């Protein structure tokens, strides 16, 4: 998973590196490059339209539309991340990045989807947004994932992008934050991953010009050292911390 630095269009070096990565990863890799590179019969991809909402549309319907747009961008399986995301940047820089993502319309992954969800829900002041990071373990390897937890009318859901359907979108129907996180943990266990750490952030400002930073790791929960009851207690403590601004 290389990261494209230098913006779009992809520079010659990053383009060649992406194609070399493809040639080594994919069997038929250089045949793949030979078929695709320079081809004149490739499909035209329509630029997906950014959803806009009537004031009468309920927020959960808007969330469905936003998740649909994010999915339409497609999950990035090319091995080259096309947008560099510096997580410590001020909000307004990340929002400019999300706007450029909407204008250039390329495949994305976990963190790009989180930033896009923040950018696309800034118009919903009754909706709170906060990042949720997962660190899991499988077959001697550690894995990291992130979604945008969401809160509306006292119920929790999520937006995001993931390889698996049960590791991204959750409609805002979970009555407590712990139930949402435990649903994610159940999906992880279903795909034979052990959940090690959960990192929950504070609410993100709805001001796209804000210079504040996203507070990614307001609560870092070691699942195994906490146990069930203390895990739930800490998740509810984070929920309280959030709803008290």
């Amino acid at each position: 998973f290389f990261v494209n630095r230098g913006g779009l269009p992809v520079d010659e070096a990053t383009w060649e590196r992406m194609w070399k990565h493809v040639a080594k990863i994919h069997p038929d890799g250089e045949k793949v490059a030979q078929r695709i590179r320079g081809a004149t019969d490739l499909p035209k991809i329509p630029i997906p339209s950014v959803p806009t909402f009537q004031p009468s549309t309920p927020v959960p319907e808007r969330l469905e539309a936003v998740q649909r747009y994010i999915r339409e961008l497609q999950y990035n399986h090319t091995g080259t991340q096309f947008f560099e995301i510096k997580k410590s940047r001020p909000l307004t820089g990340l929002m400019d990045l999300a706007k450029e993502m909407t204008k250039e319309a390329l495949p994305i992954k976990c963190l790009e989807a989180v930033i896009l969800g923040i950018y696309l829900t800034n118009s919903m002041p009754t909706l709170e947004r906060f990042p949720i990071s997962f660190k899991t373990y499988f077959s001697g390897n550690y894995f990291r994932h992130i979604v945008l937890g969401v809160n509306f009318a006292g119920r929790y859901g999520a937006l995001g992008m993931s390889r698996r359907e049960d590791l991204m979108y959750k409609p805002p129907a979970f009555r407590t934050l712990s139930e949402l996180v435990l649903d994610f943990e159940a999906a992880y266990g279903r795909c034979w991953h052990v959940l090690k750490k959960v990192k929950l952030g504070q609410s993100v400002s709805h001001d796209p010009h804000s210079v504040e930073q996203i507070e990614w790791k307001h609560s870092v929960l070691d699942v195994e050292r906490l146990g069930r009851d203390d895990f739930r207690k800490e998740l509810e403590r984070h929920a309280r911390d959030m709803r008290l601004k």
């Binding site: 269009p9 990863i25 695709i36 490739l42 090319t78």
Partner: peptide, 29 residues
């Protein structure tokens, strides 16, 4: 300017063809 738009269009089309190929590969193996 206008040539850079054609550049971005060609690159995006190739990126999505490649992404389809790699998505099929990954969903298999």
């Amino acid at each position: 300017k206008s040539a850079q738009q054609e550049l971005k269009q060609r690159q995006r089309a190739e990126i999505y063809a490649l992404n389809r190929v790699m998505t099929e590969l990954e969903q298999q193996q």
